[PDB]
């Protein structure tokens, strides 16, 4: 439960992904599957980079679950 | 910045 007693309706696995947290604490909202769940990862963990190109593309299974791991290796400094 | 942003991504990998 990431959006807490204020999440909505319903509340059920089902063919749906739901609100869903990660080690840096991505709260990653309510999806399904074959859905490409994309995000600009925090890397302003300080105050470093000055254009920032990259993103966390972050699909969900077919069975309706989260994939396995997510790609936030793309995330790199301003070179 | 020149030394925090490594461990920021390193952190990164782990997701």
Known sequence: Y???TTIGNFSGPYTYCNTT???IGTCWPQSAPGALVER???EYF???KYNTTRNAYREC???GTWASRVN???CEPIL | ???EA????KLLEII
Do not use: M, V
């Open chain 1, 21 to 23: 947290l990660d080690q």
């Open chain 1, 40 to 42: 600009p990862c925090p």
């Open chain 1, 61 to 63: 299974l077919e069975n």
């Open chain 2, 1 to 3: 910045l020149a030394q």
């Open chain 1, 72 to 74: 936030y290796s793309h």
């Open chain 1, 46 to 48: 300080n105050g470093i």
């Open chain 2, 6 to 9: 490594h461990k920021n991504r």
């Open chain 1, 2 to 4: 990431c959006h807490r």
